[PDB]
């Protein structure tokens, strides 16, 4: 489920996060678990293209923000897609709308119906 992309997981590349999101996660905010939560480090996705052969990997383009400021002049592809630890950071408006849905997902995981490790 797309709600499972909020919590970082081991061996979870950005490609899995991007693919399992509405509209391929265009215009979303993503960051790795090794980055400090208060450092304001994240990627903003502007364009996504799937792999020619595999069709399970994605080349993403966007902007890189450090301390809420751009680090480069023009959009560039994400060179660290293949690394692990990526997770989804919904915007405040999305967080408010997804409040009840997150509670439902957490309850299902707690009861054991949904296994986040498998997904």
């Amino acid at each position: 489920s797309y709600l499972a992309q909020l919590v970082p997981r081991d061996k979870r590349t950005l490609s899995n996060v991007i693919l399992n999101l509405p509209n391929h996660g265009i215009g979303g905010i993503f960051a790795r678990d090794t980055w400090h939560p208060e450092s304001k480090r994240y990627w903003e996705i502007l364009e996504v293209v799937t792999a020619k052969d595999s069709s399970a990997k994605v080349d993403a383009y966007g902007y890189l923000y450090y301390q809420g400021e751009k680090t480069h002049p023009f959009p560039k592809r994400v060179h660290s897609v293949w690394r692990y630890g990526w997770y989804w950071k919904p915007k405040p408006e999305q967080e408010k709308l997804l409040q009840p849905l997150k509670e439902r997902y957490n309850t299902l995981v707690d009861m054991g119906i949904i296994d986040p490790s498998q997904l």
Binding site: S1, Y2, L3, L19, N20, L21, P22, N23, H24, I26, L46, E47, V48, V49, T50, K52, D53, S55, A56, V58, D59, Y61, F74, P75, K76, R77, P100, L101, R104, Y105, T107, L108, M111, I113, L119
Partner: protein, 171 residues
């Protein structure tokens, strides 16, 4: 290798583009499928179609028209697992979660008699739709009761039904 700059992406796409149009293949596949294995192939076809559209530049729900046909084939075949997987990863397959689709899947599972599967579909659907219809909930409850009566002899089935009933009541 993909270009570093976004301004050079258009040239990269135009060179040796992969096959993108799979509507004809999917339509033929849906009709020809009569077993669970064919249903799995259709799911792979949906995934490839949803991923392939990005090369043209579309980011919409490509697999929005054949969802109903796939449900009908699954109900006739009698396997509900493909539908359970689809709802679990609805976005990944390019299917937009909607109430009419949830009702159709629940009715198909209820007709098959798998109340436990009906509860699973409803529970997964509740993670995409904020408000679940009360009439649909009653239908699933009836399906669970029918499932329990049909498979009352299996203790494991009874435990699964009880667990799903608690989940529906809690959520």
């Amino acid at each position: 290798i993909a270009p570093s700059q976004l301004d050079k992406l258009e040239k990269f796409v135009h060179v040796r583009p992969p096959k993108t149009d799979y509507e004809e293949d999917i339509k033929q596949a849906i009709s020809s499928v009569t077993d669970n294995e064919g249903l799995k192939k259709c799911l792979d076809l949906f995934l490839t179609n949803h991923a392939a559209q990005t090369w043209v530049g579309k980011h919409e729900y490509a697999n929005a028209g054949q969802v109903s046909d796939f449900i009908k084939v699954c109900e006739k075949v009698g396997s509900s697992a493909p539908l359970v997987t689809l709802w679990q990863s609805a976005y990944r397959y390019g299917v937009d979660p909607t109430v009419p689709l949830l009702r159709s899947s629940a009715a198909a599972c209820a007709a098959l008699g798998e109340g436990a599967d009906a509860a699973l579909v409803l529970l997964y659907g509740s993670c995409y739709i904020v408000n679940v219809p009360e009439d649909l909930a009653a239908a699933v409850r009836t399906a669970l009761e029918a499932h329990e009566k049909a498979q009352e002899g299996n203790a494991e089935a009874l435990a699964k039904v009880q667990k799903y009933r608690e989940a529906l009541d809690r959520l």
